[PDB]
């Protein structure tokens, strides 16, 4: 819920597990990292794309 | 109905120019919006499809995006080929038909004011022998188009069936207009003088031609 | 059951009744059927019989 | 690939035009042709799309019976009939080769137009039928023009003395009036060395009429 | 995985271990943060979850 009270995002485009059922799907390990890059290559952060 | 676009979203070179594509609730917001490229006086072509990628031969610098009710296209840097037209196309379920843009022209930051050269040409002797008198006068080499043509025949300004056209574009980035009439010969012989009034910015240029020249 | 859905399914907190793109997607996606694909990506026509 | 088609000239309203965007350079079993006119100044008016396998065609909500699309297999073209033409949609028609084949009305979400063929200038208004007429223009250095009146169909080819002596020609637009006729003009920027000693000849060649006319300038002072 | 660079990248056969040249450019290129470019050219804050 902390990933939603920070205004409408620019793009929530992602491919994977749906975020609506992550409250009950317990996981083993998870890592996070952030960076700043040009907006012409932000839609190119996706699995299976160069 | 038709999509809402600015008439002329121009921009000086050296920075970025942004153009918006705003439609309606069912036009843009539930269907993917498109961007098309058209050369001046030529067939159009696709510019962005699906708002995230581009075809081969399209430069990487060009980029588009969507927000939920309007579309944004971002470009940076203008050259001699960047005065082309940009259209935005979308589709909806209410009308079940493709709706294009309204038309936006971008220009760089164009000649300054000048003085037109009026060329009053009398009808030839062949025309006067055919029971007619074509009273014509022409202008050339002026920029931009602000000439307000008028008639002053020194006795009475009368207009009937004129042929007046807007200043079009020449091959040397100049303008030229026309104001013709196939007048009766007795009306032209009834006037002892003729000079069409051509005025641009205040510094008017006038030429007169006698009936006997 | 038979379902014919034309509205936008919501996947966040804001009501996606007619607005999509920021956190909600169109539920209908067309199939990618290319003849140059592999054997496992060919359109098979299937009938039921009960 | 190419999408070449025939060209129709100006005609009186109350008829039917006929052009055929030929499907060449590709196999015509996996594409669709979308039709849209480009009016000068204002926006685009989209008509519909056809199907190769079938006449399965979808029409717009503005025009229903005034435009009709039919196809053929052996010649591999498309035939249109535009009944009851009006003088308010003078626009050029484009055929576009779009990927994707759909027959339902809920398909238009993932296809786009790749290649746009060159258009056929088509326009609605009445017109004269006879050939042109070249009238001389007296000079006012001194420059003399070449007046052309009542030429149809547009365009025409202008040659100054059949290309033997030309210098500094000028291009002028066509004036607009309610009579339905159009006029053309062309003046040369010649010096005062050739004013009365050497005459200037302007000729206009017209292909539908297959005839030519000549002028005779008579300067006076 | 991640790699860092201290030496100057070489695009040919030239000794460049701290000196520039016709092909010994720096491995880092200028980007610039100016609020006069486009919306797409503006920087974006992106975070990835593994």
Coordinates of C-alpha atoms in Angstrom, one line a residue:
Chain A
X1 CA 0.0 0.0 0.0
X2 CA 3.0 2.3 0.3
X3 CA 3.6 1.8 -3.4
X4 CA 0.2 3.6 -4.2
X5 CA 0.0 6.7 -2.0
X6 CA 2.7 8.5 -3.9
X7 CA 0.5 10.0 -6.7
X8 CA -0.3 8.4 -10.1
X9 CA 3.0 7.0 -11.4
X10 CA 4.4 7.7 -14.9
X11 CA 4.2 4.0 -15.9
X12 CA 3.4 0.9 -13.9
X13 CA 4.1 -1.4 -16.8
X14 CA 5.6 -4.7 -15.7
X15 CA 5.4 -8.4 -16.6
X16 CA 5.3 -11.0 -13.7
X17 CA 3.3 -11.7 -10.6
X18 CA 0.2 -9.6 -10.1
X19 CA 0.5 -7.1 -7.2
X20 CA -3.1 -7.7 -6.0
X21 CA -2.2 -11.0 -4.4
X22 CA 1.2 -10.2 -2.9
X23 CA -0.2 -9.7 0.6
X24 CA -0.7 -13.5 1.0
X25 CA 2.1 -14.8 -1.2
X26 CA 5.1 -15.0 1.2
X27 CA 8.5 -15.0 -0.4
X28 CA 12.0 -16.1 0.6
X29 CA 14.3 -13.3 -0.5
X30 CA 13.8 -9.9 -2.2
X31 CA 16.2 -7.2 -3.2
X32 CA 15.6 -3.6 -4.3
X33 CA 17.7 -1.0 -6.1
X34 CA 17.0 2.3 -7.8
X35 CA 18.7 4.6 -10.3
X36 CA 18.2 7.6 -12.5
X37 CA 18.2 7.3 -16.3
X38 CA 16.9 8.9 -19.5
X39 CA 13.2 8.5 -20.1
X40 CA 13.8 7.2 -23.6
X41 CA 15.1 3.9 -22.1
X42 CA 12.7 3.5 -19.1
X43 CA 10.2 1.3 -21.0
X44 CA 13.2 -0.8 -22.1
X45 CA 13.7 -2.1 -18.5
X46 CA 11.9 -5.3 -19.2
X47 CA 12.7 -9.1 -19.3
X48 CA 13.8 -10.1 -22.8
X49 CA 14.7 -6.8 -24.4
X50 CA 18.0 -5.1 -25.3
Chain B
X1 CA -15.9 14.3 -32.9
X2 CA -12.5 15.4 -34.2
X3 CA -9.6 15.5 -31.9
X4 CA -8.4 18.8 -30.3
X5 CA -5.0 20.0 -31.4
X6 CA -3.2 23.4 -31.3
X7 CA -3.2 25.2 -34.7
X8 CA 0.5 26.0 -34.7
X9 CA 2.7 24.8 -31.9
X10 CA 6.0 26.3 -33.2
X11 CA 9.3 26.5 -31.4
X12 CA 12.7 28.0 -31.8
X13 CA 15.6 25.5 -32.5
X14 CA 18.1 24.5 -29.8
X15 CA 15.5 23.3 -27.3
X16 CA 12.5 20.9 -27.1
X17 CA 9.0 21.5 -28.4
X18 CA 6.1 19.6 -26.9
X19 CA 2.8 18.9 -28.7
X20 CA -0.4 17.5 -27.0
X21 CA -3.0 15.2 -28.4
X22 CA -6.2 15.6 -26.2
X23 CA -9.4 14.0 -27.2
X24 CA -12.4 12.7 -25.2
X25 CA -13.2 10.1 -22.5
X26 CA -13.7 7.2 -24.9
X27 CA -11.3 8.5 -27.6
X28 CA -8.0 8.5 -25.7
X29 CA -7.7 6.6 -22.3
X30 CA -9.0 3.2 -23.1
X31 CA -7.5 2.6 -26.6
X32 CA -3.8 3.0 -27.7
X33 CA -3.2 6.3 -29.4
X34 CA -1.0 6.7 -32.5
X35 CA 1.3 9.3 -34.0
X36 CA 1.8 9.8 -37.8
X37 CA 4.3 11.7 -39.9
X38 CA 3.5 13.5 -43.2
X39 CA 5.8 15.3 -45.5
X40 CA 4.4 18.6 -47.0
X41 CA 2.4 17.7 -50.0
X42 CA 3.1 14.0 -49.8
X43 CA 1.8 10.7 -48.4
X44 CA 1.8 10.3 -44.6
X45 CA 3.5 7.6 -42.6
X46 CA 3.6 6.1 -39.1
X47 CA 5.7 7.9 -36.5
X48 CA 5.1 6.0 -33.2
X49 CA 3.0 2.9 -32.9
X50 CA 1.8 1.6 -29.4
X51 CA 3.4 4.6 -27.7
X52 CA 6.7 2.8 -26.7
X53 CA 8.7 1.7 -29.8
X54 CA 9.5 2.9 -33.3
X55 CA 10.2 1.2 -36.7
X56 CA 13.5 0.8 -38.4
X57 CA 15.0 4.0 -39.9
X58 CA 13.3 6.2 -37.3
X59 CA 15.8 8.1 -35.1
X60 CA 16.0 7.1 -31.4
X61 CA 15.6 10.8 -30.3
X62 CA 11.9 10.9 -31.0
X63 CA 9.7 9.8 -28.1
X64 CA 6.0 9.7 -27.2
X65 CA 4.0 9.1 -24.1
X66 CA 0.4 8.9 -22.7
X67 CA -1.1 10.1 -19.4
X68 CA -4.8 8.8 -19.4
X69 CA -6.6 11.6 -21.1
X70 CA -4.1 13.1 -23.5
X71 CA -1.0 12.1 -25.5
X72 CA 2.4 13.9 -25.4
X73 CA 5.1 13.8 -28.1
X74 CA 8.6 15.1 -27.3
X75 CA 11.1 16.2 -29.9
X76 CA 14.3 18.2 -29.5
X77 CA 16.2 20.2 -32.1
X78 CA 14.8 21.7 -35.4
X79 CA 16.4 21.7 -38.8
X80 CA 15.4 22.4 -42.4
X81 CA 13.5 19.1 -42.5
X82 CA 11.7 19.7 -39.2
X83 CA 8.9 21.9 -40.5
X84 CA 6.9 18.9 -41.5
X85 CA 3.4 18.3 -40.2
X86 CA 2.6 16.0 -37.3
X87 CA -0.8 14.2 -36.9
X88 CA -2.2 12.2 -34.1
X89 CA -4.7 9.4 -34.6
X90 CA -6.9 7.4 -32.3
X91 CA -10.0 5.1 -32.3
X92 CA -13.1 4.7 -30.1
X93 CA -16.0 2.4 -29.5
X94 CA -18.7 5.1 -29.6
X95 CA -18.2 6.2 -33.2
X96 CA -16.5 2.9 -34.4
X97 CA -14.3 5.0 -36.8
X98 CA -10.8 6.3 -36.9
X99 CA -10.4 9.9 -35.9
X100 CA -7.3 11.8 -36.9
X101 CA -5.8 15.1 -35.6
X102 CA -6.7 18.7 -36.4
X103 CA -3.3 19.8 -37.9
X104 CA -0.3 21.3 -36.2
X105 CA 2.6 23.2 -38.0
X106 CA 5.9 23.8 -36.3
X107 CA 8.4 26.3 -37.6
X108 CA 11.9 27.5 -36.5
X109 CA 12.6 31.0 -35.1
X110 CA 10.7 33.9 -42.3
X111 CA 11.5 37.0 -44.2
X112 CA 11.0 40.6 -42.8
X113 CA 8.8 43.3 -44.4
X114 CA 9.7 44.7 -47.8
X115 CA 8.1 46.7 -50.6
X116 CA 6.1 45.0 -53.4
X117 CA 6.8 45.7 -57.1
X118 CA 3.5 46.3 -58.8
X119 CA 3.5 45.4 -62.5
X120 CA 0.5 47.1 -64.1
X121 CA 0.2 45.6 -67.6
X122 CA -2.2 47.1 -70.2
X123 CA -4.2 44.9 -72.6
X124 CA -2.5 44.3 -75.9
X125 CA -3.7 45.7 -79.2
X126 CA -4.9 42.2 -80.3
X127 CA -7.2 42.2 -77.3
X128 CA -8.6 45.7 -78.1
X129 CA -9.4 44.5 -81.6
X130 CA -11.5 41.6 -80.2
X131 CA -14.1 43.9 -78.6
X132 CA -12.6 43.4 -75.1
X133 CA -10.2 45.0 -72.7
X134 CA -8.6 42.9 -69.9
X135 CA -7.5 45.3 -67.2
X136 CA -4.9 43.4 -65.2
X137 CA -2.2 44.3 -62.7
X138 CA 0.2 42.0 -60.9
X139 CA 2.6 42.2 -57.9
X140 CA 5.7 40.2 -57.1
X141 CA 8.7 39.9 -54.7
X142 CA 7.0 40.8 -51.4
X143 CA 6.9 39.1 -48.0
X144 CA 4.7 38.5 -46.1
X145 CA 1.2 38.5 -47.5
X146 CA -0.4 41.7 -46.3
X147 CA -1.3 43.5 -49.6
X148 CA -4.8 45.1 -49.6
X149 CA -5.5 45.6 -53.3
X150 CA -8.0 48.3 -54.3
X151 CA -9.1 50.2 -57.4
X152 CA -8.8 53.9 -58.0
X153 CA -9.8 54.7 -61.6
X154 CA -9.8 58.5 -60.8
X155 CA -13.5 58.9 -61.5
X156 CA -15.5 56.1 -59.7
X157 CA -14.5 52.8 -57.9
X158 CA -16.8 50.2 -59.3
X159 CA -16.4 46.4 -59.0
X160 CA -18.3 43.8 -61.1
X161 CA -17.2 40.1 -61.4
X162 CA -13.6 40.5 -60.2
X163 CA -11.0 37.8 -60.2
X164 CA -8.9 38.4 -57.1
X165 CA -6.6 35.7 -55.7
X166 CA -4.5 35.3 -52.6
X167 CA -0.7 35.7 -52.7
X168 CA 0.6 32.1 -53.3
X169 CA 4.1 30.7 -52.8
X170 CA 6.7 31.1 -55.6
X171 CA 9.9 29.1 -56.1
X172 CA 12.2 31.7 -54.5
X173 CA 10.2 32.1 -51.2
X174 CA 8.3 35.1 -52.5
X175 CA 4.6 35.9 -52.9
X176 CA 2.6 37.0 -55.9
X177 CA -1.2 37.9 -56.2
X178 CA -3.5 38.7 -59.1
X179 CA -6.6 40.9 -59.6
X180 CA -8.1 40.5 -63.1
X181 CA -11.2 41.6 -64.9
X182 CA -12.4 41.0 -68.5
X183 CA -13.9 44.5 -68.7
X184 CA -15.8 45.9 -71.7
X185 CA -13.6 48.0 -74.0
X186 CA -15.9 51.1 -73.8
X187 CA -15.5 51.1 -70.0
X188 CA -11.7 51.1 -70.3
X189 CA -11.8 53.8 -73.0
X190 CA -14.1 55.8 -70.8
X191 CA -11.4 56.0 -68.1
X192 CA -8.4 58.2 -69.0
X193 CA -6.2 56.7 -66.2
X194 CA -5.7 53.4 -64.4
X195 CA -3.6 52.5 -61.4
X196 CA -4.5 49.7 -59.0
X197 CA -3.8 50.7 -55.4
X198 CA -1.3 48.3 -53.8
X199 CA -0.3 48.9 -50.2
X200 CA 1.9 46.9 -47.9
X201 CA 2.7 48.2 -44.3
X202 CA 2.2 51.8 -45.4
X203 CA 5.0 52.3 -47.9
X204 CA 2.7 51.8 -50.9
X205 CA 4.1 51.3 -54.4
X206 CA 2.0 52.5 -57.3
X207 CA 2.4 52.3 -61.1
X208 CA 0.2 54.0 -63.7
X209 CA -0.1 53.2 -67.4
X210 CA -1.8 55.6 -69.9
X211 CA -4.3 54.3 -72.5
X212 CA -1.8 55.4 -75.1
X213 CA 1.1 54.5 -72.8
Chain C
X1 CA -20.4 -19.4 -18.2
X2 CA -20.0 -16.8 -21.0
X3 CA -18.6 -13.4 -20.2
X4 CA -18.5 -10.4 -22.5
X5 CA -16.5 -7.6 -20.9
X6 CA -15.8 -4.2 -22.5
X7 CA -15.1 -2.0 -19.4
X8 CA -11.6 -1.5 -17.9
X9 CA -10.6 -3.9 -15.1
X10 CA -9.0 -2.0 -12.2
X11 CA -5.7 -3.3 -10.7
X12 CA -5.0 -0.5 -8.1
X13 CA -7.0 1.8 -5.9
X14 CA -8.2 4.5 -8.2
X15 CA -11.5 3.7 -10.0
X16 CA -10.7 2.6 -13.6
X17 CA -14.2 2.9 -14.9
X18 CA -13.1 4.5 -18.2
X19 CA -9.5 5.5 -17.7
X20 CA -6.6 3.1 -18.3
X21 CA -2.9 3.2 -18.8
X22 CA -1.4 4.3 -15.5
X23 CA -2.4 1.3 -13.3
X24 CA -5.1 -0.6 -15.3
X25 CA -5.0 -2.6 -18.5
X26 CA -7.5 -3.7 -21.2
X27 CA -8.5 -7.3 -20.3
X28 CA -8.6 -8.4 -24.0
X29 CA -5.3 -9.1 -25.7
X30 CA -5.0 -10.5 -29.2
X31 CA -3.0 -13.7 -30.0
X32 CA 0.3 -13.5 -31.8
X33 CA 0.1 -15.9 -34.7
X34 CA 3.2 -15.7 -37.0
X35 CA 3.9 -18.4 -39.6
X36 CA 7.6 -17.9 -39.0
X37 CA 7.3 -19.0 -35.3
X38 CA 7.9 -22.4 -33.9
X39 CA 5.7 -25.5 -33.8
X40 CA 4.5 -24.5 -30.3
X41 CA 3.2 -21.1 -31.5
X42 CA 0.8 -22.2 -34.2
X43 CA -2.9 -21.6 -34.2
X44 CA -4.6 -25.0 -33.4
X45 CA -8.4 -25.1 -34.1
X46 CA -10.2 -27.0 -31.4
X47 CA -13.8 -28.2 -31.0
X48 CA -15.6 -29.6 -27.9
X49 CA -17.8 -32.6 -27.7
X50 CA -19.7 -33.4 -24.5
Chain D
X1 CA 6.1 -2.4 -52.4
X2 CA 3.9 0.0 -54.3
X3 CA 0.3 1.0 -54.4
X4 CA 0.0 2.8 -57.8
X5 CA -3.5 3.8 -59.0
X6 CA -5.1 5.7 -61.9
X7 CA -5.9 9.4 -61.8
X8 CA -9.2 11.1 -62.4
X9 CA -9.5 14.7 -63.4
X10 CA -12.1 17.3 -62.5
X11 CA -15.8 16.6 -63.4
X12 CA -19.3 17.9 -62.8
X13 CA -21.0 16.7 -59.6
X14 CA -23.6 14.1 -60.1
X15 CA -21.4 11.3 -61.4
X16 CA -19.2 8.4 -60.1
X17 CA -15.4 8.5 -60.1
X18 CA -13.3 5.3 -60.5
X19 CA -9.8 4.6 -59.3
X20 CA -8.0 1.3 -58.5
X21 CA -5.3 1.1 -55.9
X22 CA -3.3 -1.9 -57.4
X23 CA -1.9 -4.4 -54.9
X24 CA 1.5 -5.0 -56.3
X25 CA 4.8 -6.0 -54.7
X26 CA 3.1 -8.3 -52.2
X27 CA 0.7 -11.2 -52.0
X28 CA -2.9 -10.1 -51.5
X29 CA -4.1 -12.6 -49.0
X30 CA -3.0 -11.2 -45.7
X31 CA -3.5 -7.4 -45.7
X32 CA -6.3 -4.8 -45.6
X33 CA -6.8 -1.5 -47.5
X34 CA -8.1 1.5 -45.5
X35 CA -9.5 4.5 -47.4
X36 CA -9.3 8.1 -46.1
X37 CA -9.4 11.4 -47.8
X38 CA -7.2 14.4 -46.9
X39 CA -9.0 17.7 -47.2
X40 CA -6.7 20.8 -47.5
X41 CA -6.5 22.5 -44.1
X42 CA -8.9 20.5 -42.0
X43 CA -8.7 17.0 -40.8
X44 CA -9.0 13.5 -42.2
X45 CA -12.2 11.7 -43.2
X46 CA -11.9 7.9 -42.9
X47 CA -14.3 5.7 -45.0
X48 CA -13.6 2.0 -44.2
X49 CA -11.6 -1.1 -45.0
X50 CA -12.0 -4.1 -47.3
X51 CA -11.2 -7.8 -47.1
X52 CA -9.4 -9.8 -49.7
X53 CA -10.9 -13.1 -48.9
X54 CA -14.3 -11.5 -48.8
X55 CA -16.4 -8.4 -49.3
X56 CA -16.6 -8.3 -45.5
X57 CA -16.4 -4.5 -45.4
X58 CA -17.2 -2.0 -42.7
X59 CA -18.6 1.4 -43.6
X60 CA -18.4 4.7 -41.7
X61 CA -21.4 6.2 -39.7
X62 CA -21.4 9.3 -41.9
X63 CA -21.5 7.8 -45.5
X64 CA -23.5 4.6 -46.1
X65 CA -24.7 4.4 -49.7
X66 CA -22.8 7.2 -51.3
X67 CA -19.6 5.2 -51.3
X68 CA -19.3 1.5 -52.2
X69 CA -16.2 -0.8 -52.3
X70 CA -15.9 -4.0 -54.4
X71 CA -12.9 -6.3 -55.1
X72 CA -11.6 -8.8 -57.6
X73 CA -9.2 -11.7 -57.5
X74 CA -7.6 -12.2 -61.0
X75 CA -6.8 -8.6 -61.6
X76 CA -6.1 -8.0 -57.9
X77 CA -7.4 -4.5 -57.6
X78 CA -10.2 -2.6 -55.8
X79 CA -13.2 -0.9 -57.5
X80 CA -15.1 2.1 -56.0
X81 CA -18.4 3.8 -57.0
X82 CA -18.9 7.2 -55.5
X83 CA -22.5 8.1 -56.4
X84 CA -24.0 11.6 -55.9
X85 CA -20.8 13.6 -55.6
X86 CA -21.0 17.0 -53.9
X87 CA -18.9 20.2 -54.2
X88 CA -17.7 20.2 -50.5
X89 CA -15.2 17.3 -50.2
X90 CA -12.5 18.2 -52.7
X91 CA -9.8 15.9 -51.3
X92 CA -7.2 13.4 -52.5
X93 CA -7.8 9.7 -51.7
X94 CA -5.1 7.5 -50.1
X95 CA -4.9 3.7 -50.0
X96 CA -2.8 2.3 -47.1
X97 CA -1.4 -1.2 -46.7
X98 CA -2.2 -2.0 -43.1
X99 CA -1.1 -5.2 -41.3
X100 CA -3.6 -7.5 -39.5
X101 CA -6.8 -9.1 -40.7
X102 CA -10.0 -8.7 -38.6
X103 CA -13.7 -9.0 -39.5
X104 CA -15.3 -8.0 -36.1
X105 CA -15.9 -4.4 -35.1
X106 CA -13.9 -4.8 -31.8
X107 CA -10.6 -5.5 -33.5
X108 CA -9.2 -2.0 -34.0
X109 CA -6.6 -1.9 -31.2
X110 CA -3.3 -3.4 -32.5
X111 CA -3.0 -2.7 -36.2
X112 CA -1.6 0.3 -38.0
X113 CA -1.0 1.6 -41.6
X114 CA 2.6 0.9 -42.7
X115 CA 2.9 2.3 -46.3
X116 CA 0.8 5.0 -47.9
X117 CA 0.7 5.1 -51.7
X118 CA 0.7 8.3 -53.6
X119 CA -2.8 9.8 -53.9
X120 CA -5.0 10.4 -56.9
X121 CA -6.0 14.1 -56.9
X122 CA -9.8 13.9 -57.1
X123 CA -12.1 16.9 -56.7
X124 CA -15.6 18.0 -57.2
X125 CA -16.8 20.8 -59.4
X126 CA -18.3 21.5 -62.8
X127 CA -15.9 22.6 -65.7
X128 CA -15.6 23.6 -69.3
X129 CA -14.4 21.0 -71.8
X130 CA -12.8 22.9 -74.7
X131 CA -9.1 23.8 -75.0
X132 CA -7.1 26.7 -73.8
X133 CA -6.7 30.2 -75.2
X134 CA -3.4 32.2 -75.1
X135 CA -3.8 36.0 -75.2
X136 CA -0.8 38.4 -75.4
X137 CA 0.0 40.9 -72.7
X138 CA 1.4 44.3 -73.5
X139 CA 4.5 45.4 -71.7
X140 CA 4.7 48.3 -69.3
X141 CA 13.0 47.5 -68.2
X142 CA 9.8 46.2 -69.8
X143 CA 8.2 42.8 -69.2
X144 CA 5.4 41.1 -71.1
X145 CA 3.2 38.3 -69.9
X146 CA 1.3 35.4 -71.3
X147 CA -2.4 35.2 -70.4
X148 CA -4.2 31.9 -70.6
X149 CA -8.0 31.7 -70.0
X150 CA -10.5 28.9 -69.9
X151 CA -8.3 25.8 -69.9
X152 CA -9.8 22.4 -69.0
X153 CA -8.9 19.8 -67.8
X154 CA -6.1 21.0 -65.5
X155 CA -3.1 21.1 -65.8
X156 CA -1.6 22.5 -69.0
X157 CA 2.0 22.7 -70.3
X158 CA 3.4 26.2 -71.2
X159 CA 6.3 26.5 -73.6
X160 CA 7.8 29.9 -74.6
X161 CA 8.4 29.7 -78.4
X162 CA 8.6 25.9 -78.0
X163 CA 11.6 26.3 -75.8
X164 CA 13.7 28.2 -78.3
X165 CA 13.8 31.5 -76.4
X166 CA 12.8 31.6 -72.7
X167 CA 14.3 33.4 -69.7
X168 CA 13.0 34.3 -66.2
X169 CA 9.6 32.7 -66.3
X170 CA 7.2 33.2 -63.4
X171 CA 4.5 30.9 -61.9
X172 CA 1.1 32.3 -60.9
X173 CA -1.8 30.6 -59.2
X174 CA -5.4 30.2 -60.5
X175 CA -8.0 32.8 -59.7
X176 CA -11.3 31.8 -58.2
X177 CA -14.8 32.9 -59.4
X178 CA -18.3 31.6 -59.6
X179 CA -18.3 31.0 -63.3
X180 CA -16.3 27.8 -63.0
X181 CA -13.5 28.8 -65.3
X182 CA -9.8 29.1 -64.3
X183 CA -7.0 31.3 -65.7
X184 CA -3.2 31.1 -65.8
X185 CA -0.5 33.8 -66.3
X186 CA 3.2 33.8 -66.9
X187 CA 5.5 36.8 -67.3
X188 CA 9.1 36.7 -68.3
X189 CA 11.7 39.0 -66.7
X190 CA 13.4 40.1 -70.0
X191 CA 15.5 43.2 -70.3
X192 CA 14.9 46.2 -72.6
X193 CA 17.3 44.9 -75.3
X194 CA 14.5 42.8 -76.8
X195 CA 11.3 44.8 -76.7
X196 CA 10.2 45.5 -80.2
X197 CA 13.1 44.3 -82.3
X198 CA 12.6 40.6 -81.3
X199 CA 9.1 39.3 -80.6
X200 CA 8.3 36.9 -77.8
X201 CA 6.1 33.8 -78.5
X202 CA 4.2 31.9 -75.8
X203 CA 2.5 28.6 -76.6
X204 CA 0.4 26.3 -74.4
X205 CA 0.1 22.6 -75.4
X206 CA -3.0 20.7 -74.2
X207 CA -3.1 16.9 -74.3
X208 CA -6.9 16.1 -74.0
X209 CA -7.7 18.6 -76.8
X210 CA -4.5 17.9 -78.9
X211 CA -4.3 21.4 -80.2
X212 CA -2.3 24.6 -79.7
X213 CA -2.8 28.3 -80.0
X214 CA -0.4 31.2 -80.5
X215 CA -0.3 34.8 -79.5
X216 CA 0.8 38.0 -81.3
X217 CA 2.1 40.7 -79.0
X218 CA 1.9 44.3 -80.3
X219 CA 3.7 46.7 -77.9
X220 CA 2.9 50.4 -78.1
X221 CA 4.4 53.6 -76.7
Chain E
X1 CA 26.7 -8.3 -11.7
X2 CA 28.5 -4.9 -11.8
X3 CA 31.8 -3.6 -13.1
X4 CA 33.6 -0.4 -12.4
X5 CA 36.1 1.4 -14.6
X6 CA 39.2 3.5 -13.6
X7 CA 41.4 3.3 -16.7
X8 CA 40.5 5.0 -19.9
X9 CA 38.8 2.8 -22.5
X10 CA 40.7 2.1 -25.7
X11 CA 38.9 1.6 -29.0
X12 CA 42.0 0.5 -31.0
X13 CA 45.7 -0.1 -30.5
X14 CA 47.2 2.9 -28.6
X15 CA 48.7 3.1 -25.1
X16 CA 46.2 5.0 -23.1
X17 CA 46.5 4.3 -19.3
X18 CA 45.6 7.8 -18.1
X19 CA 45.8 9.9 -21.3
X20 CA 43.3 10.8 -23.9
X21 CA 43.5 10.7 -27.7
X22 CA 41.7 10.3 -31.0
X23 CA 40.1 7.1 -29.7
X24 CA 40.9 7.0 -26.0
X25 CA 37.8 8.8 -24.9
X26 CA 36.5 8.8 -21.3
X27 CA 34.1 5.9 -20.6
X28 CA 31.5 8.4 -19.2
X29 CA 29.5 10.8 -21.4
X30 CA 27.9 14.1 -20.3
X31 CA 24.2 14.0 -19.8
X32 CA 23.1 17.3 -18.2
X33 CA 20.1 18.2 -16.0
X34 CA 18.3 21.1 -17.7
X35 CA 14.6 22.0 -17.2
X36 CA 14.2 23.0 -20.8
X37 CA 14.2 19.6 -22.6
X38 CA 11.2 17.4 -23.3
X39 CA 9.1 15.4 -20.9
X40 CA 10.7 12.2 -22.3
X41 CA 14.1 13.8 -22.1
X42 CA 13.5 14.6 -18.4
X43 CA 15.1 12.2 -15.9
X44 CA 12.9 9.5 -14.3
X45 CA 13.2 7.8 -11.0
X46 CA 13.0 4.0 -11.6
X47 CA 13.3 1.2 -9.0
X48 CA 13.4 -2.5 -9.8
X49 CA 12.4 -5.4 -7.5
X50 CA 14.0 -8.9 -7.7

